[PDB]
């Protein structure tokens, strides 16, 4: 409702942030334009912005942000030659022009791998012209991730900027930097697979599924809030998520900032943990809030049995308004259990619902639903037990060999997944082990759910459109809370015909000695999957015996071709 919207945004964000976000937003629409062209356009938009700051009444200062972006986009002179139909958007009036740009954000980019320079070269470059070096990489990530919400991409950039400061100075520029950059990469990976999971989930499962999830997550977060307040938050969050998924950066950022403002003007009835977030500038407020730790729950909440099992009014209260009642149940359950994953809370509410449907229909409903809590039993135990055993295995073996145990396990279940994907999914599950198994027990399930749900959804995006397995499509298109259970119930594939021996696959040279850590790991792991694909029936003593001998073939050789010939020979018979 301001006179100059571009001026208002520039005085609030601050110039450095405004330039960064302008660069991100243009790079996400104009993906094939070279860095220096985006620089020129940024400088132009920034300079016009300043005229509005100095005089809100200056020409064109009163146009909306949408109009000004669209107008700028339509002055790029090679728009049609490079973008084709996207130039057709320019002929259209603004409500419509802006919708048209939205439908044309490419997403298969098609760009070439971004190779990390050598550390020596990045530090050098960071030092000689810090902004070009950072800004160019923001541009590179943004054009390769055109749906990544722009302020979050800016928040990560500030993290890289921090890291180069830190490390481009000390005794070793590899023992400071590399593990920071590697942690930033996995974490950026997650953040992005996560935004796509939220949006695709809303389509597949519906607003109702989505809302159940939010009731649960926010009840865990704000266990002191009243249900009515939790429900108002999920209704507004639902609408935000919905606008953000439609994709218009300004509209998403407006709704998110409105929700932030509400949250902060109501801290006392939501959470004693919001003080710091609610002091942050607008740009980081909502982001801080979505990341806040769970508040402490209030002391000695009653058990759930009274309102949900014991009351004579159960069926009556349910049937008046079934979703509100199930949402009260889910709220009451989740506030008590910061330690459950959200999907387990859903599985629990969905169980309570299936039980009230059957039983409320009976002459004596109470006798029928009297044991429902006992049904929550094994639902809770199952994920806790799988987590417990996998962290113990992880403790017993360490990451790389845990990764290896995960390879033979998953290759036997779904041998017809390609070798790189199996390698990839297993190295990554190993990372979820090493990050989640450091939580005590009462944090492990929420952790595990976070990362696995990310890892599985991408699994499921790959598979779709490159289908190799009916059992993977089954798990990938299951309901939301059934997905991870479905993968977990996968057994060793008894259908699978062994891959025929391939001579080249188990022949290695001197290189493996000299390549890096990682790459030697991938190479050995590729071979191992290949090993399992050829003898799907190998027992574990037999695999180990063969793995110990590969490491002894590698150990003493660094004889690659004649021994390897008898590495193979000996192996094809300890497995024959
Ligand atoms: C062997 C690949 C190494 C990593 C890939 C490059 O470093 C790009 C850098 C990214 C980043 O930082 C965040 C997201 C992208 C990568 C994600 C998906 C690419 C798949 C579809 C596509 O990009 O065509
Ligand atoms: C992404 C922050 C915005 C600006 C951050 C710094 O400019 C980056 C500087 C880099 C560097 O010097 C070497 C590698 C990174 C780029 C890496 C991956 C791209 C996508 C990975 C992801 O999804 O974060
Ligand atoms: C398509 C043109 C993009 C407009 C430039 C970005 C404006 C900055 C929005 C940042 C506000 C974030 C609000 C929030 O996420 O809580
Ligand atoms: C997602 C659930 C995050 C817990 C707290 C929600 C804060 C709302 C911030 C708006 C983000 C859309
Ligand atoms: C797999 C997704 C469905 C999970 C739903 C299980 C039963 C809980 C229903 C909650 C309905 C949303 C009502 C609300 O809490 O606002
Ligand atoms: C911390 C476990 C290391 C990673 C290995 C895979 C184990 C999967 C445990 C599943 C818990 C999922 C949450 C849920 O579905 O309720
Ligand atoms: C493409 C499917 C190959 C298997 C790779 C990951 C399988 C899903 C794992 C989910 C976490 C482990 C599930 C489990 O073993 O209980
Ligand atoms: C029939 C071919 C026999 C050689 C193929 C064996 C592949 C062994 C990979 C095992 C590496 C995991 C343990 C390690 O890196 O030391």
| Nearest partner of 26 among 13, 45, 9, 7, judged by Cα | 45
| Cα–Cα distance measured from residue 106 to residue 28, given in angstroms and rounded to the nearest whole number | 9
- Cα 63–Cα 25–Cα 38 angle in degrees, nearest 5: 95
* Domain 107-196 matches domain 382-493 at the CATH topology level: yes
Owner of token pair 């094939």? 32
| Cα–Cα distance measured from residue 444 to residue 484, given in angstroms and rounded to the nearest whole number | 15
CB 329 within 8 A of CB 308: yes
| Residue 248 annotated in ligand binding | yes
| Nearest partner of 425 among 440, 407, 449, judged by Cα | 407
Domain 494-561 has CATH 3.50.50.60: no
HSE-CB for 428 with a 13 A CA cutoff: 20
Residues preceding chain discontinuities in the chain with C to N over 2.5 Å: 558
CB 526 within 8 A of CB 419: yes
Please state the length of the chain.
576
| Cα–Cα distance measured from residue 335 to residue 215, given in angstroms and rounded to the nearest whole number | 10
| Burial status of residue 328 (CB atoms within 10 A of its CB: 0-12, 13-18, 19 or more) | buried
**R_g over Cα of the chain:** 28
- Give the pair of three-digit tokens for residue 139: 């541009």
| Cα–Cα distance measured from residue 333 to residue 331, given in angstroms and rounded to the nearest whole number | 5
| Cα–Cα distance measured from residue 260 to residue 340, given in angstroms and rounded to the nearest whole number | 26
Backbone angles phi, psi at 304, to 5 degrees: -80, -5
| Residue 2 annotated in ligand binding | yes
Contacts with 441 (C-beta within 8 Å, 6 or more apart), sequence order: 339, 384, 388
- Give the pair of three-digit tokens for residue 351: 């169980």
Max Cα distance, the chain (Å): 85
Domain 382-493 has CATH 1.10.246.10: yes
Closest atom of ligand 1 to 145 CA is 14
Owner of token pair 């459950």? 340
HSE-CB for 489 with a 13 A CA cutoff: 11
| Nearest partner of 135 among 15, 283, 20, judged by Cα | 20
| Residue 130 annotated in ligand binding | no
CB 308 within 8 A of CB 360: no
| Nearest partner of 415 among 544, 524, 538, judged by Cα | 538
240 lines ligand 4 (CB under 6 A): yes
Contacts with 439 (C-beta within 8 Å, 6 or more apart), sequence order: 447
| Cα–Cα distance measured from residue 289 to residue 264, given in angstroms and rounded to the nearest whole number | 9
Q: Report the number of secondary-structure helices (H) and strands (E) in the chain.
A: 28, 0
Determined by which method? X-ray
217 lines ligand 4 (CB under 6 A): yes
For the domain bounded by 107-196, which CATH number is listed? 1.10.246.10
CB 481 within 8 A of CB 347: yes
Owner of token pair 């790029």? 76
CATH class of the domain comprising 1-106: mainly alpha
Distance 211 CA to ligand 5 centre (A): 7
Q: What does this entry list as its resolution, in Å?
A: 2.2
Residue ranges of domains in the chain: 1-106, 107-196, 204-295, 296-381, 382-493, 494-561
| Nearest partner of 49 among 16, 24, 76, judged by Cα | 16
The architecture that CATH gives domain 296-381 is Orthogonal Bundle (1.10)
Contacts with 555 (C-beta within 8 Å, 6 or more apart), sequence order: none
The architecture that CATH gives domain 204-295 is Orthogonal Bundle (1.10)
Measured from CB, residues less than 6 Å from any atom of ligand 7 are 386, 410, 414, 417, 425, 452, 456, 459, 472, 484, 487-488
Helix (H) or strand (E) holding 549: helix 540-557
């Amino acid at each position: 409702a301001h006179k100059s919207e571009v001026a208002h945004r520039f005085k609030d964000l601050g110039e450095e942030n405004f330039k960064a976000l302008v660069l991100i937003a243009f790079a996400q629409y104009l993906q094939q334009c070279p860095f220096e062209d985006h620089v020129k356009l940024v400088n132009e938009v920034t300079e016009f912005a300043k005229t509005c700051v100095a005089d809100e009444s200056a020409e064109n200062c009163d146009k909306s942000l949408h109009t000004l972006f669209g107008d700028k986009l339509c002055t790029v002179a090679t728009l049609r030659e490079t973008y084709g139909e996207m130039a057709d958007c320019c002929a259209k009036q603004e409500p419509e022009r802006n919708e048209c740009f939205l439908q044309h954000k490419d997403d298969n980019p098609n760009l070439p791998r971004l190779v990390r320079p050598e550390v020596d070269v990045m530090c050098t470059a960071f030092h000689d012209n810090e902004e070009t070096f950072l800004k160019k990489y923001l541009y590179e990530i943004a054009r390769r991730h055109p749906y990544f919400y722009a302020p979050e991409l800016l928040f990560f950039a500030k993290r890289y900027k921090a890291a180069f400061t830190e490390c481009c100075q000390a005794a070793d520029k590899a023992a400071c930097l590399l593990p920071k950059l590697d942690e930033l990469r996995d974490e950026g990976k997650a953040s992005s697979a996560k935004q796509r999971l939220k949006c695709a989930s809303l389509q597949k499962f519906g607003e109702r599924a989505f809302k159940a999830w939010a009731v649960a997550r926010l009840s865990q977060r704000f266990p002191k809030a009243e249900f009515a307040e939790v429900s108002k938050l999920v209704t507004d969050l639902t609408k935000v998520h919905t606008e953000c998924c439609h994709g218009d950066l300004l509209e998403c950022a407006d709704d998110r900032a409105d929700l932030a403002k509400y949250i902060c003007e109501n801290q006392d009835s939501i959470s004693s943990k919001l003080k710091e977030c609610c002091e942050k500038p607008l740009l980081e407020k909502s982001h801080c809030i979505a990341e806040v730790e769970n508040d402490e729950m209030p002391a000695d909440l009653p058990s759930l049995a009274a309102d949900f099992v014991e009351s004579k009014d159960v069926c009556k209260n349910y049937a008046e308004a079934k979703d509100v009642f199930l949402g009260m149940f889910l709220y009451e359950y989740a506030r008590r259990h910061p330690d459950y994953s959200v999907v387990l809370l859903l599985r629990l509410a969905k169980t309570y619902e299936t039980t009230l449907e059957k039983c409320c229909a009976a002459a004596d409903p109470h006798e029928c639903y009297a044991k429902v809590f006992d049904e929550f039993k094994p639902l809770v135990e199952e994920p806790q037990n799988l987590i417990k055993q996998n962290c113990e295995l992880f403790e017993q073996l360490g990451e790389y060999k845990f990764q290896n145990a995960l390879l033979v396990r998953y290759t036997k279940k779904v041998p017809q997944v390609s070798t790189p994907t199996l390698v990839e999914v297993s190295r990554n599950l190993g990372k979820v082990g090493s990050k989640c198994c450091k939580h005590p027990e009462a944090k492990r399930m929420p952790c595990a759910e976070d990362y696995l749900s990310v890892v599985l959804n991408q699994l499921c995006v790959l598979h779709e459109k490159t289908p190799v397995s009916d059992r993977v499509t089954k798990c990938c298109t299951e309901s939301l809370v059934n997905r991870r259970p479905c993968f977990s119930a996968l057994e060793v594939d008894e259908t699978y015909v062994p891959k025929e021996f391939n001579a080249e696959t188990f022949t290695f040279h001197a290189d493996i000695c000299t390549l890096s850590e990682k790459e030697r790991q991938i190479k050995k792991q590729t071979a191992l999957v290949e090993l399992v694909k050829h003898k799907p029936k190998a027992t574990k003593e037999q695999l180990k015996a063969v793995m110990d001998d590969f490491a002894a073939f590698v150990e003493k050789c660094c004889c690659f071709a004649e021994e390897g010939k008898k590495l193979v020979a000996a192996s094809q018979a300890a497995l024959g």
